[model samples]
Target: DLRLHLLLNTSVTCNDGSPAGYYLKESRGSRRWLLFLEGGWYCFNRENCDSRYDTMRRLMSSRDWPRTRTGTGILSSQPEENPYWWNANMVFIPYCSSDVWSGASSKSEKNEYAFMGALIIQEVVRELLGRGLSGAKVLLLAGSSAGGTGVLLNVDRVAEQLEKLGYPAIQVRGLADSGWFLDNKQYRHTEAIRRGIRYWNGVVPERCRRQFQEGEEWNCFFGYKVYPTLRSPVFVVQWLFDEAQLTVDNVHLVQEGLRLYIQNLGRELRHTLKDVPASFAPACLSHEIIIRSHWTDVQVKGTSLPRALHCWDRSLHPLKGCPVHLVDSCPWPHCNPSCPT
Candidate 1:
């Protein structure tokens, strides 16, 4: 909660003539806070893709976003942008495959996770120290698909850093729209579906094997160990037919079930997976649908639930007492510190 007593000194200014920003405002309290912002991954590098990232940044960074524009009717009705949000800062860093960026495959297989988290850590430390926000709590506000994966994949590492810094507990809040949890099974399955089974059908089986390899160690996906360590509040926002990305198998299932589901739930799902939340063209997967879950007839708009969907459309916010509105199940429900009391 924002401390009302600590009124933000709106009159403050940086010595270099820039916005004094959150570092100063957040540091005023004896309480410490850490805010981590993760954006989506779009263009791989300078070549293969469209110049969509820039415009995406502008849209997300817009101060008038989230909050409705002060104009007219329903169109003007929106929530105010929260400083505690990932987009609060409006800067997006790419974690696309380095191959997409520099035509170089990453040696550290966890390239996207490591690269983004490292830079974020460096910047956070620099910014906090620069503004005298040493030893404060850390909050992570991320969106889009990739943004969600980043939290699932790196929350542990993010927490470890905070622990080393001597903060009692780094409070993290994750907000995701159609995000993926980078688990070994899920990652391998998604990649296979994206490339096709032909990926493993060729004479080059070794190369094919490398692509789907799920190393035993906690390498690519952050695994469960770190997820529980985060000790932060989470808010996940998604659509039922969020155009979610699923295994090619799941993609096919949607097409087969279109009569009772989205015309192309598979494709939409895949699309959602590819786009993540931090994109420009009005990301529908995350922002459009406040909540979508396989657990209900969400994809169909008006279908009734025979039973609660496994984990989809489930609200995972432990801090809010796991409101019935969110019925999704978490991987570590029994382990979450906030689950009880």
Candidate 2:
């Protein structure tokens, strides 16, 4: 069901300045498009950029990433495997611009580099429209990790662009998985956020400065700061004790710091996402929700991630009646007792 296409547009380039491409799986008699962005943390400093340059070929070049890389889950074209999006034309945008698709500009040292993630998204969408996205009836802009952040920051813009492209009937929605990290002072995630904003020349500072504050515009990179500004409906997915956020420089949390950070993240989620259509934040130590293995296996309380998303998509966009505002179902069950305190 899937066919890979390398975009001919030379303007759409990756962080390494390589041409960007996507895998498209067309569906018959369907006007839906599922655009999934790939996820990988950003490279801010020289050391990390060098390391990324050496090890992150998959994110840099499509030639390095084989067909196996585009395995199951939301990308699955098989009807039995991915029922929700089986009939929807799926476009998997590979992650090459490491700025979570927010960078309006780039920074480089020697041969190493970074590209405008935001521009890349814009170009990719432009290219896709020419292929058939202009005719799409519904578009799901979703991503995991860094890709998730990209979706949150660019979802509204993407919807607007589709409308401009004359696809007025297209309904654009989003799903951000494990991307809603809180802007907490305890963990000092602001440090990384600031670094990313500077290195990527991210638009957050300029776009969100009016509403937030000077010197604190980097907070816009976080969900609590950006989610409220989103125009299109988006479902936020996360884990109370996301294991990915627990480690730094390969060192796992062994102190009370992690507990405090997770607690604060939970509080922020409740405060910011209270008005969102629906969310899924289980009390577990895992990360990334929309995988084939964890998508169905994991659950918060009694609601599974896939089921919750399906229900939300259905309830949000009924065929006839006005869209229902399903109250947020974000239940943060207690963190695992085994987690470090």
Candidate 3:
């Protein structure tokens, strides 16, 4: 009988051709509600916000949602999509706002502050309207690299949404998927780098040459701009021997660089939402380190982790993990951006 807030990553959906959505387990005796919003792609069809929702639905099907008591589900039900509903012992309530990228077509988008401000307002309006919610607790969940950064950048907007919903309690739990702060730090000059390059993995050192020049922090939307207004539960899942550690865009080596960015965050946000309570458990896991137990080149079943930052193991969060099923099953294929083994 609790409300949960689940937030997904960006560019997850391309178009609205297929149903393309996430799924939930068919547990009985509980109610579930949703106020899901999906973000669009920067380079792809930036206008098709519907696809984002679709992608969101698909990803949800794969992950195991926490327990819930109620079953009231809220969905965007975009132009060509069907509504979604869920039932379980522990109610899982979550929501999302549109993509938070500053997609400036011209010089007009250069003023990062002004651009982000407008978007934040838009997010507040969308969440309140979309959920039709008033005075409910919300918990946000995100993982991997960019996702971790996304959740951090969106604190203000998320808080604004909570305020509009009659000051509902809000919280954030996330995994800093190795590359969380790398993209924005090293890929300043080109979109190719920002979108992720396959060869040699992620961005290069030249790209990390001090992000946030015009008030940017690494590849993260992090900094002080949105820190002032943040008040919610905050949980961070930091990995130690991350695979992306040595890439041209690794943030671990740049201790001072990373420190400076967070320092500004702490400075502007004197008191963060640290004390607020999160609805879910904060679990951390290691893939690269664990994978080495098998072999470097061999890709065995359940051997390699989903990505340099996948956290879908039962051991990490025993309660959420299905005890009978060691091989965690996603509701669908590629929902977590990986092919099932």
Candidate 4:
């Protein structure tokens, strides 16, 4: 039995200058935490932010958030469904800043927007220490889509900051669901990320920032660039045939073009994921898992994400989890029957 409640604080805020916060469900049963960041595609410039304000105001503004939210998937309390995280303290942070949870600015663009996502995690964890996380044995900073990308950007930072806060014993890990975005030249990703860095004052780990320097600071936005710099253990959750990646200009590709895109995506994902040892990437046209109702349905080489996650928790056992890297062998999409259609 778990219940998650909304906790909004003015110290951190959304783009529209409204209070920002997360949904928390405290569990005295275990000293484990699952801090999840919600995902929403971002707005990089004033015109984009302005357009977002009128079209998708909820993404940038938090004035409409509800006081309560029910947990599901990885956050669910049902042991049969959630498996590993059933009893863990659950926290869901909504994506209000629209900066992929990496901004450091506040009230920029003539006081029209407030990009404080970087500070949000820092400050929120500080507050959590007082609320029960101080004694946490493990904290899994997890998210999907851009939120998952946020994990690659924030996992190490979170761990390092925990040590800074004098909590070195707490194990901080990452679970990025469908967030392994590629730096494909085919898309306007670099330009789009570049604009966000300029407009949102995007913040990345100093170590990662140093890895690219001034001209390529935005390079860390891609998982492949930041993964090598991450010290904390992270379980990469992705789809070989990511529907979201295939969606260009907000529309999913079709027929012949789609098939080629699928193969190329799978091929790239296979090559890019070679370094990541703890991951579960299935060949399917799925966007996100972990938050899905049947999260356990998806699998690779007969092992599911839930099983791999549990195996990952056994960090002391060298052979158990870190080698849980399971990627589909199929080159085509929807080859896995478990693919959630």
Query: Which predicted model would earn the best TM-score?
Result: 4
lDDT to native, each model: 0.30, 0.68, 0.29, 0.82
- lDDT by residue for model 2 over 1-341, one digit each (tens)? 45666668765667666677777776767888888888888877667776887788777566665553454776776655665566677777888877778776643454356567777777778888877887877788899988888888888888777778777888889888888775444454257778867766777524566788766667777787787777788888866656665553232543576555555655665566566657776655565547453355554555455567677777764434322222223333344332222
| Every model's TM-score | 0.42, 0.83, 0.35, 0.93
Residue 117's C-alpha lDDT in candidate 4?
Answer: 85
The runs of at least 3 residues in candidate 2 whose Cα sits more than 4 Å from the true structure, single-residue gaps closed, are: 67-71, 106-112, 187-189, 205-209, 213-215, 248-272, 318-341
lDDT of 1 at 319: 22
Native-referenced Cα lDDT, model 3 = 0.29
Residue by residue across 107-195, what tens digits does model 3's lDDT show?
A: 12431111121232233334433443232333333323433444454444455555675554433222222222222243111344343
Q: Which stretches of candidate 4 lie over 4 Å from their true place?
A: 1-9, 187-189, 249-251, 254-258, 316-323
Local lDDT at 313 for model 1: 23
Query: lDDT tens string, model 1, 1-341?
Result: 11111113322221111112221223254433333333444333232222442454331222222221121111111123221121121222323221111111212333221112333333444455444444444444443454554444444444555567675454544444445433322222234222211211111112223443533222222212333333444444444333334332243322344433333432343343342222211212222321222212222122122111112123322223222123222221122222212
**Which is the winner by lDDT between candidate 1 and candidate 2?**
2
Which residue segments of model 1 deviate by more than 4 Å? 1-38, 42-117, 130-132, 135-138, 181-189, 192-233, 244-256, 260-325, 328-341
Error of 2 at 177 (Å): 0.4
Candidate 4 or 2, higher lDDT: 4
- In candidate 3, position 341 carries an lDDT of 21
Instruction: Give the poorly placed runs of model 3, Cα more than 4 Å off.
Output: 1-135, 165-230, 249-341
- lDDT string for model 4 (202-239, tens) is 98878889978986778898888888888888889888
Backbone clash numbers for all candidates listed: 30, 0, 40, 0
Highest lDDT scorer: 4
